[PDB]
Design a protein around this ligand. Sequence first.
Ligand SMILES: [Zn+2]
Lengths: 342, 263, 104, 235, 104
Amino acid sequence: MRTLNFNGKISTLEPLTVTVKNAVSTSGHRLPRNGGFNAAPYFPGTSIRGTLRHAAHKVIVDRVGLNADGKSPFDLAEHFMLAQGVDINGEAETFAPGEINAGAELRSKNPLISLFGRWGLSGKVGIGNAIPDGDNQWGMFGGGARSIMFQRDESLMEFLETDQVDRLERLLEEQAEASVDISQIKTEQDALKKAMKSADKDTKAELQIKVRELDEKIQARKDQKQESRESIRRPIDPYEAFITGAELSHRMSIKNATDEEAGLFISALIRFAAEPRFGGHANHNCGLVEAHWTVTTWKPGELVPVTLGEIVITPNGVEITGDELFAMVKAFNENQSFDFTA
Amino acid sequence: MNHPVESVYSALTSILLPYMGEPVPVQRNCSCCGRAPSEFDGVGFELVNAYRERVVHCRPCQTFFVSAPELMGVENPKKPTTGQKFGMWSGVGAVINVEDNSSVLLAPQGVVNKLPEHFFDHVEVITATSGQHLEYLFNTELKFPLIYIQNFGVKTYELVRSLRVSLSADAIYTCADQLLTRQNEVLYMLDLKKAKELHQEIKNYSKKEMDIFIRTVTLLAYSRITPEAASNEFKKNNLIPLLLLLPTDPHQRLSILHLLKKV
Amino acid sequence: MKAESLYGYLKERGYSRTFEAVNRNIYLENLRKVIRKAKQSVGRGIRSENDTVRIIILDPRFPEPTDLSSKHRSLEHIIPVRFRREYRSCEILSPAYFEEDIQC
Amino acid sequence: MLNFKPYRVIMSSLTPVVISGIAPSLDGILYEALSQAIPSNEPGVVLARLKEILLFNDELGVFHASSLRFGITPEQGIGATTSMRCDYLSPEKLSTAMFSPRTRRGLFTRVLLTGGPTKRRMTTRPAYSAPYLTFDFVGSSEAVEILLNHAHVGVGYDYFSAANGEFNNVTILPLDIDTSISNEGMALRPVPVNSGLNGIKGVSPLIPPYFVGEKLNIVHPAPVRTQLISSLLRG
Amino acid sequence: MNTSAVFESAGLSLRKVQQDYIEAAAGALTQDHKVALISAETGVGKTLGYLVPALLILLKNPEAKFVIATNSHALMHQIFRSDRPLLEQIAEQCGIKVTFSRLM
DNA sequence: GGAGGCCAAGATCTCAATTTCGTACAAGAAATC
Ligand SMILES: [Zn+2]
């Protein structure tokens, strides 16, 4: 039973972005910032926690393997218990509320539910956020334009048959005229948003519904397009990411740890290193990270950190350092009495 | 007996007590409120929801899952034989007087249309959208203790276990079918007394000064303008007394601003 | 060129970090050398227990006591821990306008 | 048992802080930090060892550890942000390689994510995003500094799971007057009703952890308190 | 052991920092093949700080040696000028001597 | 004939728009491989 603090740096190999509803607004896609636009963005610890929980779930799946029938032994209930800790079939040990150290049997038998908790059983892994070290380590990456393929490469028109070349011509015509119509409607809409600022509240009971009916007219016009519902020539909005090679300070911890739980966590890190991806926009290879975690623990009784080893995940390999981390991994690999089902 | 869900049942949904049936003696806690069977007198209603789970609901909780189209009108014409359910209403609110056991139903005009004339006899209904709840609360002389269900919503379980009695105008618990954790009761706490005094002192300020104050506080609460800019704006517009009446909590500020610009 | 050449080192040794990352690492290393050198400078001040030194840091970039988010906050480590209280209560030659902002 | 000094700890808030109704007390943060530092969750022993690094008011039954108070700078202020925890049922999660979906004619019954016990839970919580978090306490600076710097403890709700209210650059400055329990008769942390200290009435245990033990009536400060960082560093 | 006294048996104005340095340095030097990192701000008597563990550790296995590399001409001058009295004086209590050298 | 699953329907609404820039030196000792 040792509290393992993985204090370390995440160096970003490809830009690291995440979409959070509150952070993202109409003005554009922005990272969680904890303050104004001038504040410092942080990559959520929730995204890293979920990614590592998924990695641990995959490690558990591989260790369990498949049945003789080639199907995972886990059903939907067990899968959602291990993946997001939600009991769907209402069949879970509803531990009494006032014992902190409750569920020791489930913790021993299920190390995944131990590290990352279920509903009603506090998890042992607190995965903190990847805080950037610098001042200009974020940027509006992505961005571009979904270009009409045949208006860029003329040779692609030699593949289109005339009964489809006229279809393309109709599509471009409809896109253009629907887009100037939507532009006019948007011009009325923004003029109305200007007029909102002189609100006397006699008009406002009408103005917002007028705006809504203009949005409905926009949707109707988009529906009116017979050949393509959405304009193809779209300028892609940029997404805010952490720059390539951004050194983000990361603090992760496992609370009091049987060798098996820590071994499962280290195996989850070793499997995450196969695809070290945090966040979305994976189309642009976003999220690829390499991170060195100094695994410190607390001396028994004394308030001092002793360094047990280092977890250096890099594209070239995972360098587990320290004999004790190897011992934890070996303990997890052994002790095959785990019963992840229910 | 003494619970928020019993009180709402007695005040508001006991009108559909004839459309319940005889409960079945049960021995396991209501899956909806979560309370123990000890206060159900040992009885309960067994039921299966759309997700095929055996669920016990108690006398007050089962009233949210009743189909009484002849009384509560037809909510979806595609399914005529299933009327409006209290646990399925979205945008429909209610103010229940616990002492008087009377309820007022703040339903929007669509729901009011869907309601039969027979319904208004048992419950007084005021045509009000979700945005018009706050003006109703402001103008009407609310009698406490009371239960203010802001949005009956679709998550009946979270509504019933989120119900909290509003003991005085200091603290009105706006229950909106969203689990009322201690971490999110600030978003469901309405300081009607403090908002009322703030509105009273808003009359002393011009419409332009009121708009500037509202926008400055909203921007500050969303951290869009620096505190130094907001302080400059308040000092230049002589808005210090209004700020002195606002709670330091930014979510309380946003709620009270919503309340001001709704009325 | 230290940043560029060190980037060459990491590139040819296989480590994948972009050149701007090596620039940042070199910057942080140099800033820690600056912290050590300035600590030496302040150590010039007091050598005997009876020594009394009035240290005048005329650099605008030395973090103010009230500016805990200042870019070069690590330079505050130049002052020894024991004399950090007078660092907090220090006369500022050219301070920056504060106010009585009601939203305290 | 060790000599304890009034210290004010100011740290940079890196993520929005979620307040569980009552303002997070520094004693709860230190209790979690110790529970991590001594690998034992028993409240009794962790409390016994917390007294050795925090002063404990015996006649009042509370730790000399003021509640959270946000330090707002003229550039950044207390803000209303939402801590959003959202289920991400990815296609890889929603795949036969990890579980066996119930089959019907060789088609896999899709998980009904819209509603039901297997929905994409979009839990939104109020969070407060201030540039600085401040506490006051009467204790050993060394131990609390080590804990706050290296123990995996944040300010607010479920810092383990949601990573809420993470902080760095923890700075401790000694105070001249004990402002942990009382300040001009205004309670600066959860204190019992009978203490004569005025504030906001509430129900909570006086000593951490604040989720076990009888919830007796207490007076606690305003959950969201704001002070200028200059006023806080004045001492 | 004489270590406990040193400054109270021979007689010197011990501070808490000095005894802390002596104990930590001796414990470090006990560790074999390790590298000991100590920051000692001006005022801790660093010379004494690392010369006291040398003389006390000499008690066990007195064939050990401690090369003291000091960068500057002036650091070297002041330290050895100050330590020629001091370390001799101190060792006079345990009975050990000082084969002080003058390498350069 | 009962039990799973897919799909359409249900009340109006609540709100806020940053505008790029780090850091600018000295010398300790020397039988160097
Ligand atoms: Zn119930």
